[PDB]
Design a binder for this molecule. Structure first.
Ligand SMILES: *[C@@H]1O[C@H](CO)[C@@H](O[C@@H]2O[C@H](CO)[C@@H](O[C@@H]3O[C@H](CO)[C@@H](O)[C@H](O)[C@@H]3O)[C@H](O)[C@H]2NC(C)=O)[C@H](O)[C@H]1NC(C)=O
Ligand SMILES: *[C@@H]1O[C@H](CO)[C@@H](O[C@@H]2O[C@H](CO)[C@@H](O)[C@H](O)[C@H]2NC(C)=O)[C@H](O)[C@H]1NC(C)=O
Ligand SMILES: *[C@@H]1O[C@H](CO)[C@@H](O[C@@H]2O[C@H](CO)[C@@H](O)[C@H](O)[C@H]2NC(C)=O)[C@H](O)[C@H]1NC(C)=O
Ligand SMILES: *[C@@H]1O[C@H](CO)[C@@H](O[C@@H]2O[C@H](CO)[C@@H](O)[C@H](O)[C@H]2NC(C)=O)[C@H](O)[C@H]1NC(C)=O
Ligand SMILES: *[C@@H]1O[C@H](CO)[C@@H](O[C@@H]2O[C@H](CO)[C@@H](O)[C@H](O)[C@H]2NC(C)=O)[C@H](O)[C@H]1NC(C)=O
Ligand SMILES: *[C@@H]1O[C@H](CO)[C@@H](O[C@@H]2O[C@H](CO)[C@@H](O)[C@H](O)[C@H]2NC(C)=O)[C@H](O)[C@H]1NC(C)=O
Ligand SMILES: *[C@@H]1O[C@H](CO)[C@@H](O[C@@H]2O[C@H](CO)[C@@H](O)[C@H](O)[C@H]2NC(C)=O)[C@H](O)[C@H]1NC(C)=O
Ligand SMILES: *[C@@H]1O[C@H](CO)[C@@H](O)[C@H](O)[C@H]1NC(C)=O
Ligand SMILES: *[C@@H]1O[C@H](CO)[C@@H](O)[C@H](O)[C@H]1NC(C)=O
Ligand SMILES: *[C@@H]1O[C@H](CO)[C@@H](O)[C@H](O)[C@H]1NC(C)=O
Ligand SMILES: *[C@@H]1O[C@H](CO)[C@@H](O)[C@H](O)[C@H]1NC(C)=O
Ligand SMILES: *[C@@H]1O[C@H](CO)[C@@H](O)[C@H](O)[C@H]1NC(C)=O
Ligand SMILES: *[C@@H]1O[C@H](CO)[C@@H](O)[C@H](O)[C@H]1NC(C)=O
Ligand SMILES: *[C@@H]1O[C@H](CO)[C@@H](O)[C@H](O)[C@H]1NC(C)=O
Ligand SMILES: *[C@@H]1O[C@H](CO)[C@@H](O)[C@H](O)[C@H]1NC(C)=O
Lengths: 244, 99, 86, 35, 370, 49, 50, 34, 50
């Protein structure tokens, strides 16, 4: 139940600095007051990160998604290869109630969205889903800086999350914050592209303040420090600077 | 009292000993060609007719590491003994009389 | 080498006496260090004591002689040297 | 070569010769006093 | 002991290091998660239909209790060969995310299912990894997978542009250009359909009859465990050097109530060089820490066998509170003393001080009067 | 020991740090030679003529 | 069989390198002793009457 | 800059002469002032 | 012609006797080859590293 529109909104995709964000706990092993060197996929320090003020973007190795969001406008996520019923795709919906993760051969249209009614009752992201296996329900994932890392390694889909209070207006904070692991999925797909979903007020869609930061990961070596409480407080990139 | 880093010799001797011990104890975490770097796991997993081969690989690797450490310790001890003899001589002439 | 394994100990036993001489060398090194310290420092047969009243023509050795107040009985310079290196 | 490298000495032969010349001039002119 | 370790009937007055002692462990502790349920092995084994070689059926097994005795005692399996572990210890370990890959092949190609093997299906259909861990089971299915009319449902690949990566799947039925002239999607000269059917007939002899193959693939301690064996757990005891098996992690030491903090996702911890210093029990979800029970070298002090036959035993770097190489004789009422070097048994401390014989360490030295 | 080979490097990777400790000695030797020359010759503070 | 052959090659080259390093260390120690003796001789004899 | 020891980048070459701080080789070395 | 190796190839003035195919200097290190098609004496130098 979705139809075409006329207001072809184009997001002024600007560029900005990644700074030193996007560091997550690599393993499930506790370490305290120790310097550990590990080689894995990470977001390179001081890199270009794209800012959107809903196009199709590649997945590449992994995806870092950030939002200096107010009132949690961003709701969903769509992953896949061709985004059609021909190839298995993945969908994540985090509404006001428990978050739902599905993998199915959805039939996405041009402009999928949730839509709310003003007492909300609407779900018209897709049209059909014929064959599929896995489903999952958990507690909801979500003025505040929300950071998420999506990785696809060895048929395993890792989603890492972190929420932080923020006060700066536009630029990313020049601080450091680790990303605790959130969800692991033992399902393997050939994901290569992903989307973003908005909670437009359908009563006439009105979604213009949809701004988010998107970055891509690369494999490299980091040196992390674990404090007395086992929390990563500092990291150093290797292949960035002769001093580094 | 004020200027630091005036005791470089003893500090570097201690650092050399500490780093030698650190690398010796760190060498224990190497596969050396076997399937695991921990001996209890390979004992608990597979049949001793092959545990003998795996433990043999571990044994030869650790023997090489230990022999290297012992040789380095011997060289360092010889150097330290020479320095101690020189210090004893200096105490013999300079302190107990005019040189 | 083996870490409390009977099979590993039995396998190592057939390699011959490799590490016995290593243990002997380590013990010899420790004895050598003890002898080095003893021969460097033990240069005297007795133990002397400075008189309680000190008038050395003007020279002042208070910074080098041990201080009775400290329980370690180590002088100021020795204390500074001990505190500097760790 | 085959992965082996030779590093040049920090002190060139000219500086060593200069040290020797200075030492020899000092011991000829001054004696043991300059030590 | 000194006479045996010095190879002489006469020993002079001196100190000789003899051996080292350890605190022996008592009983054992086995701790496994409380979850239990029969694991679904019937469907993966007793399957009415089996897919082709190029479309091998992959199934995931998790959150189950697996009994490998039934899979080993049965003689219906023609071949049961394992690589990473001996088959008798399959029920003694715990894994997570088990994988089962099932298919049907010819009898002569069963040798190709092995690491570092070159062949037709071992290179273009299903290539095993060189470092594979797990097991392979193969058995005869002539009576069910072979029909008098000939089974054409089993299709296998013969032509491919390149080789196959380990654990790779290829399903594209594209026309193959075997020559310089491109086929352009047209069958003809230098063009062949990459898939070909088996000639499975009951008239065929051994080696040609269809064979059913299942490959079981495991992991080795890469995540929290979920598939344990049929072993039963037991209670835990603290402040005692005991043997423990925490969810497959074996060891020997003394456990204590730990004070470190684990985040809700962490399982255990270590500091330097695989020294697992903390564990979380799968049942109570409580934090404990592990330290090895005490051990250390032992040395002797004798005044020379010429003078007397009295010895004093020193244990190096061991607290004198606990000591009882058994030699329990020096544990009844003999004099004991504690020093920075360890503990001394058999010597009596005397307050007087004078230039002395044989040394011990830390400024304390012994001599003969007792 | 590898002659720019990937397989040789991968096989050597599972041996630990023999190479670090090996290279850590030649540098010390070279510094020792430099110190030897400096202490043997640089016995004066000025340059005379 | 290639990993086995490469293993033989690399291990043998390893003993060769270890032996070379050990000989270099011994020779360096001896040269250091000689240099110390030369420095002492140059200290007492050149700068004064011995 | 090009030296008998190799090629050095990031630091400029001057015509003066002071006491040596961080040895480089061939009779030359660098120091901090850049 | 079956002899494999990495390096930089320059023109050389060495004069092979008319029956050799490739030369060397010491310690079994090739330094010059003869191209089978043209029969010209080349020189092989290991490209720089450090
Ligand atoms: C996962 O998805 C990627 C998508 O890129 C697959 O790689 C291959 O990508 C190309 C896009 O260039 C797909 O189109 C094909 O391109 C070739 C070369 O131009 C052309 O000759 C073909 O006719 C076709 O247009 C290609 O279909 C795609 N490969 C496959 C097998 O779909 C990658 O293979 C995917 N991996 C898996 C495991 O599915
Ligand atoms: C298409 O969408 C854009 C974005 O929502 C609309 O632009 C906004 O229009 C409102 C109406 O006055 C303004 O208050 C906002 O400031 C505009 N935003 C921006 C970024 O310019 C636009 O009006 C829509 N057009 C149609 C025909 O629906
Ligand atoms: C580390 O964790 C502790 C435990 O929650 C945090 O709480 C501190 O605990 C210490 C000793 O227990 C107290 O002296 C502090 O006053 C506590 N601080 C707070 C804010 O509660 C501690 O903050 C954490 N971080 C550090 C650096 O210790
Ligand atoms: C020797 O030197 C010490 C150190 O300066 C002198 O001790 C100081 O004496 C003055 C005057 O009595 C005090 O104000 C200082 O506080 C003392 N310093 C310390 C560290 O105690 C000492 O008096 C000198 N002795 C002689 C005989 O000159
Ligand atoms: C497939 O089916 C056969 C037959 O139903 C199963 O064999 C049975 O195994 C149980 C367990 O040992 C025995 O008690 C029965 O007596 C067996 N039946 C026969 C007829 O021998 C077999 O276990 C099934 N496969 C799996 C994986 O469970
Ligand atoms: C041997 O162990 C006992 C008990 O574990 C130690 O006694 C403790 O000593 C510390 C100070 O060293 C005190 O704070 C504790 O209160 C003591 N506990 C008990 C139960 O006595 C003893 O010190 C250890 N031996 C040595 C040489 O340290
Ligand atoms: C190698 O084969 C080619 C094929 O013709 C020939 O090489 C030519 O030889 C002539 C004189 O012999 C030269 O003038 C040409 O420059 C050569 N090259 C070409 C491309 O013609 C000859 O048959 C063989 N050359 C040898 C054996 O040296
Ligand atoms: C990348 O970062 C540079 C540095 O600010 C910037 O000039 C450029 O526009 C960014 N984007 C691309 C595509 O180079
Ligand atoms: C939110 O999602 C849950 C899970 O699918 C669903 O049950 C519920 O109806 C949705 N809407 C609201 C308002 O909770
Ligand atoms: C399910 O899969 C089969 C074969 O994979 C396909 O033919 C079919 O169209 C799919 N959908 C339904 C509803 O059967
Ligand atoms: C933002 O995040 C903080 C977490 O510190 C949370 O307490 C708060 O409810 C969130 N939302 C807003 C609007 O602050
Ligand atoms: C979990 O373990 C506890 C303690 O072993 C036991 O009392 C409880 O019944 C178990 N629950 C389940 C669902 O296995
Ligand atoms: C051993 O004891 C006897 C008995 O007094 C004595 O005569 C002899 O001298 C002793 N041996 C030595 C080497 O002193
Ligand atoms: C040694 O003297 C101390 C005095 O502090 C006393 O406590 C101790 O009992 C004395 N030892 C013996 C053996 O008399
Ligand atoms: C150093 O001196 C040379 C010789 O005159 C001159 O050519 C050069 O420009 C000078 N460089 C500087 C930086 O003074």
């Amino acid at each position: 139940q979705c139809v075409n529109f006329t207001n072809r909104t184009q997001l002024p995709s600007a560029y900005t600095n990644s700074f030193t964000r996007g560091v997550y706990y690599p393993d499930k092993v506790f370490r305290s007051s120790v310097l550990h060197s590990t080689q894995d996929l990470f977001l390179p320090f001081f890199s270009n990160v794209t800012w959107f003020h809903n196009p199709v973007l590649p997945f590449n190795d992994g995806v870092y998604f950030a939002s200096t969001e107010k009132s949690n406008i961003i709701r969903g996520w769509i992953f896949g290869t061709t985004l059609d019923s021909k190839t298995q795709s993945l969908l994540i919906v985090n509404n006001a109630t428990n978050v739902v993760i599905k993998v199915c051969e959805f039939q996405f249209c041009n402009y999928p969205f949730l839509g709310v009614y003003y007492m909300e009752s609407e779900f018209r992201v897709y049209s059909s889903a014929n064959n599929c296996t896995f489903e999952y329900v958990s507690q909801p994932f979500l003025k505040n800086l929300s950071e998420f890392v999506f990785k696809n390694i060895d048929g395993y889909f890792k989603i890492y999350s972190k929420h932080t209070p923020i006060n700066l207006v536009r630029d990313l904070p020049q601080g450091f914050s680790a990303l605790e692991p959130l969800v692991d999925l033992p399902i393997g797909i050939n994901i290569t592209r992903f989307q973003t979903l908005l909670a437009l007020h359908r009563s006439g869609w009105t979604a213009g303040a949809a701004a988010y930061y998107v970055g891509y990961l690369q494999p490299r070596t980091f040196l992390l420090k674990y404090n007395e409480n086992g929390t990563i407080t500092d990291a150093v990139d290797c292949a960035l600077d002769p001093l580094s | 009292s004020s200027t630091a880093s005036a005791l470089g010799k003893l500090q570097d001797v201690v650092n050399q000993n500490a780093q030698a011990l650190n690398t010796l104890v760190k060498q224990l975490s190497s596969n050396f060609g076997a399937i695991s770097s921990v001996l209890n796991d390979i004992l608990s997993r597979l049949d001793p007719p092959e545990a003998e081969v795996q433990i043999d690989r571990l044994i030869t690797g650790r023997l090489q590491s230990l022999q290297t450490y012992v040789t380095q310790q011997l060289i360092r001890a010889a150097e330290i003994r020479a320095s101690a003899n020189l210090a004893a001589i200096k105490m013999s002439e300079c302190v107990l009389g005019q040189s | 080498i083996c870490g409390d394994s009977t099979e590993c100990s039995n396998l190592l036993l057939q390699y011959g006496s490799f590490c016995t001489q290593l243990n002997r060398a380590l013990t010899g090194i420790a004895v050598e260090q003890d002898k080095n310290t003893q021969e460097v420092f033990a240069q005297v047969k007795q133990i002397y004591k400075t008189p309680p009243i000190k008038d050395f023509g003007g020279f002042n050795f208070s910074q080098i002689l041990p201080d009775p107040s400290k329980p370690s009985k180590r002088s100021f310079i020795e204390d500074l040297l001990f505190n500097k290196v760790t | 070569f085959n992965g082996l490298t030779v590093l040049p000495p920090l002190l060139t032969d000219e500086m060593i010769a200069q040290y020797t010349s200075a030492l020899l001039a000092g011991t000829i002119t001054s004696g043991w006093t300059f030590g | 002991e000194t006479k045996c370790t010095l190879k002489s009937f006469t020993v002079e007055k001196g100190i000789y290091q003899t051996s080292n002692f350890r605190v022996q462990p008592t009983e054992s502790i086995v701790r496994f998660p409380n979850i239990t349920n029969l694991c679904p092995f019937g469907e993966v084994f007793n399957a009415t239909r089996f897919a082709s070689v190029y479309a091998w059926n992959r199934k995931r097994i998790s959150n189950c209790v697996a009994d490998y005795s039934v899979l080993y005692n049965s003689a219906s399996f023609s071949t049961f060969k394992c690589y990473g572990v001996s088959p008798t210890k399959l029920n003694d370990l715990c894994f997570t995310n088990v994988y089962a890959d099932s298919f049907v092949i010819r009898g002569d190609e069963v040798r190709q299912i092995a690491p570092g093997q070159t062949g037709t299906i071992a290179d273009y259909n299903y290539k095993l990894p060189d470092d594979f861990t797990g097991c392979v089971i193969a058995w005869n299915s002539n009576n069910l997978d072979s029909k008098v009319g000939g089974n054409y449902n089993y299709l296998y690949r013969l032509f491919r542009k390149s080789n196959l990566k380990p654990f790779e799947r290829d399903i594209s039925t594209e026309i193959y250009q075997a020559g310089s002239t491109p086929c352009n999607g047209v069958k003809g000269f230098n063009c062949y359909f990459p898939l070909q059917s088996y000639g499975f007939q009951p008239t065929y002899g051994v080696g040609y009859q269809p064979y059913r193959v299942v490959v079981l693939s495991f992991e080795l301690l890469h995540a929290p465990a979920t598939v344990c064996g049929p072993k039963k757990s037991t209670n835990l005891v603290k402040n005692k050097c005991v043997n423990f098996n925490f969810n497959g992690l074996t060891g020997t030491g003394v456990l204590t109530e730990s004070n470190k903090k684990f985040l809700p996702f962490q399982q255990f911890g270590r500091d330097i060089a695989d020294t697992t210093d903390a564990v979380r029990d799968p049942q109570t979800l409580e934090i404990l820490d592990i330290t090895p029970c005490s051990f250390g070298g032992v040395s002797v002090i004798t005044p020379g066998t010429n003078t007397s036959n009295q010895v004093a035993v020193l244990y190096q770097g061991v607290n004198c509170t606990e000591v009882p190489p058994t030699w329990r004789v020096y544990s009844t009422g003999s004099n004991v003393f504690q020093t920075r070097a360890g503990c001394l048994i058999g010597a009596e401390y005397v307050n007087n001080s004078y230039e002395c014989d044989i040394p011990i360490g830390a400024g304390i030295c012994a001599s003969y009067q007792s």
